[PDB]
Structure 1
């Protein structure tokens, strides 16, 4: 397979699952990815793209304006080997997630194409310019030359975009290959630039794409992210140290774990740092929701739609860990006293929801042990709906306890 230019030949195709490993070399290269030493590499240069994901469009016009999905716009990258990642996963560079126009997150699948560039595309001989169009308002432009350093200088490709401060890297000119281009070895004498000025009539056509703006809330953008409100935690009780091992075994007795303890003993912060550690160590995806917010709990159908949404989302991503805060408000037995249990019918409104959830998840879990797990939080093991225990949905368990004076002081 030789492409539209005889300079380029196509070698092999694979699909791989995106993960985070926090290895990058921004002072050297950006538009690059790293692949396991077990995934023996046919070529260090290639093309990649997100495998687009969105809901079925199960309703006419999807109830919203956008008519058709934007194409993949696949980007060429360098590929470099490392042992530090598990098989078939990919480390995707920080300045590449933003090009793929979604927050950096272990999750969606990547396309990977392996490529040959022939001697027809070696150093020099096409001293091409590139437009650096400003896609949003900025200081009166800095020099184009500095971008040859600050983009690392490793690689480029036509029609590149960088939303971090909204610049477009694009060229469409004769006497250039208009493809993947080398840059790492190339002298700055062999390249030119246009720091092309602002213009609404140009940018508004690009803004017709899917643009769920990533930093729409004011935080000084990616330039400074003036929005931190979090920290580490004081490692008081080792509960983290047990659970993070357990919940990441190759296989588990049942899909569910329950976490309980006295009000204010610190469920929430602990869950946040369990999330963060799981999100950093072993490539598990998370989706997280609060019983306060999904106020559909007055109705069945839309709530059912939410549960099927979470199920589907999980099953399309990699291994994932669903976590729920104060589950009693969603699935708890609605009267703590049994009372008259609706003339002993016992099926009050709530339990239906939980039954549908357990049925769906069980159907998933019988397929493959990793595909989903769930982590409840509540006040007391025995106060949540016994039907949760009846079906043997949960087994292993932990409780937090009043921290012992020694660690308590070390916390203080």
Structure 2
């Protein structure tokens, strides 16, 4: 088939899946897309688009008419071959995402088309022209030459929005195909650029299109957001390695994994880094729930819709993963009993959801092993509803035991660095500094460090971070989370000494309590 322009020809349609493996290249290009090594590329250039996801549109599209129906948009793209990315996946560089007005999520279907053509490759075949018009609230006017250097330096197609700087690319030269046009193969003397501001009426008319404002939540820029309170993670324990090795295996036993823990011992941050890792080098889509934020859990019919929606999305996308922090809120057996029929104790209001979820998941897992998998976490293994172990949903388990001596050093080092002002004296060292901190955990440690920062800042009458001989005193005033909740006592002030003839006993005590 030959395109509307007689010099351009169509070859074949193909479908692939997106990835965020961060393939990079210089500024000259904006629409580079990386195909995998394998079947040779029938053409160097092409067209691309994404098949938009949508709900069932039930209840008249959730009471929204959606009268402005649009068939998305068609884009042109460079395509290049790479060896790292798997066969079925497609790499979509940082640009051209904002064109689709969709966040660069891991998995999404790409329609890809290979384009052939004869004439327009010739250098300076005809003069090129285009207008880079400001769409929304805009930076003051700038030269079109630097815009061309920055925008579509090698290739572009009309009707492309860009919310990254609120601009529109347009041209109506006349008798023009309104299709793909190459730029870097054309000399500067055979191309023209101009800039204007778009009319308010046309701006609001275009705003009617499907343009989800990505920065509706306040941000300082595309490269900086205040949400990043913590932007590092310390490889204290092997478990992150384990889960990465097992969860991503080509074949798995049972859909589910369970991640137990203890009060603040690591769970949420560990899962958030597991997301941040697994999303990159293994092309796994992830849906994060945090069931606590989920409202109206006990409304079974309403919650069931979200339960179905989760797995529906997860199945539509590529090999995916489901993760629930603090599961016991949504699928937890109350376990409190005074009198109840055995069947209702087996099947109460909460478990119904669990059975539905299990059945729905198994419906997929039993016909596509690598498609969908779930990863629960909760305060305690056994505490969770027995259905999981009964129905054989969870197979392997892991526990975040409190970090060992060798590990705490790294954690304290990192938390000390985080405040960027605290530092030890030449005479003091980390590894010894930790040993007194027995029975702690990262919550304990982080609050203890803040406590040290306060006690050094005012209570020592010094500006610089004097950091010895107050450590013990501060610790004395501290109470680890575990101890904090039960009836310990330190009331006795009588010193280590004050011994008498009780030496013959104190020896023994040393030999059985301290040694």
Shorter-chain TM-score: which interval? over 0.9
Deviation at 1:229, TM superposition (A): 2.8
2:234–2:411 CA contact under 8 A, matched in 1: yes
**Taking structure 1 as reference, are residues 344 and 75 closer, same or farther at Cα in structure 2, changes over 3 Å only?**
closer
Distance 1:225 1:154 in 2: 31
TM-score w.r.t. structure 1 length?
Answer: 0.96
1:288–1:322 CA contact under 8 A, matched in 2: yes
Deviation at 1:151, TM superposition (A): 2.2
Secondary structure of 1:345 counterpart = helix
**Taking structure 1 as reference, are residues 344 and 148 closer, same or farther at Cα in structure 2, changes over 3 Å only?**
closer
With 137-146 and 107-116 compared, the bigger mean Cα shift is at 137-146
Secondary structure of 1:286 counterpart = strand
Distance 1:17 1:382 in 2: 39
Deviation at 1:126, TM superposition (A): 2.3
With 382-391 and 52-61 compared, the bigger mean Cα shift is at 52-61
**Taking structure 1 as reference, are residues 41 and 71 closer, same or farther at Cα in structure 2, changes over 3 Å only?**
same
Distance 2:103 2:138 in 1: 23
Distance 1:4 1:258 in 2: 56
Secondary structure of 1:137 counterpart = coil
Q: Structure 1: state its 5+ residue gaps.
A: none
**Taking structure 1 as reference, are residues 337 and 411 closer, same or farther at Cα in structure 2, changes over 3 Å only?**
farther
Match of 1:396 in 2: 396
1:37–1:81 CA contact under 8 A, matched in 2: yes
Deviation at 1:26, TM superposition (A): 4.3
1:35–1:89 CA contact under 8 A, matched in 2: yes
**Taking structure 1 as reference, are residues 339 and 395 closer, same or farther at Cα in structure 2, changes over 3 Å only?**
farther
Distance 1:139 1:165 in 2: 8
Deviation at 1:62, TM superposition (A): 2.8
Between structure 1 and structure 2, the one with the greater Rg is 2
**Taking structure 1 as reference, are residues 337 and 39 closer, same or farther at Cα in structure 2, changes over 3 Å only?**
farther
- 1:326-352 CA-partner distances (Å, limit 9, x unpaired): 000100002345753577553110000
With 330-339 and 207-216 compared, the bigger mean Cα shift is at 330-339
Normalized per residue, which structure has more strand? 1
Structure possessing the higher relative contact order (Cα contacts under 8 Å, 6 or more residues apart): 1
**Taking structure 1 as reference, are residues 177 and 122 closer, same or farther at Cα in structure 2, changes over 3 Å only?**
farther
2:327–2:378 CA contact under 8 A, matched in 1: yes
Deviation at 1:276, TM superposition (A): 0.6
Number of residue pairs matched? 412
- 1:270-312 CA-partner distances (Å, limit 9, x unpaired): 0000001000110000000112111121301110000000010
Deviation at 1:253, TM superposition (A): 0.5
Secondary structure of 1:196 counterpart = strand
With 19-28 and 363-372 compared, the bigger mean Cα shift is at 19-28
TM-score w.r.t. structure 2 length?
Answer: 0.77
Secondary structure of 1:98 counterpart = helix
Deviation at 1:39, TM superposition (A): 3.9
- 1:236-267 CA-partner distances (Å, limit 9, x unpaired): 01110111110000010100000001111010
Distance 2:40 2:396 in 1: 40
1:137–1:198 CA contact under 8 A, matched in 2: no
With 173-182 and 144-153 compared, the bigger mean Cα shift is at 173-182
Q: Structure 2: state its 5+ residue gaps.
A: 413-515
1:284–1:321 CA contact under 8 A, matched in 2: yes
Normalized per residue, which structure has more helix? 2
RMSD (CA atoms): 1.7
Deviation at 1:28, TM superposition (A): 2.5
Distance 2:126 2:205 in 1: 30
Secondary structure of 2:258 counterpart = strand
2:35–2:79 CA contact under 8 A, matched in 1: yes
Deviation at 1:33, TM superposition (A): 0.4
User: Is 1:382 matched up with 2:395?
Assistant: no
With 238-247 and 189-198 compared, the bigger mean Cα shift is at 189-198
Distance 2:113 2:404 in 1: 56
Distance 2:225 2:261 in 1: 35
**Taking structure 1 as reference, are residues 360 and 343 closer, same or farther at Cα in structure 2, changes over 3 Å only?**
closer
Distance 2:126 2:226 in 1: 43
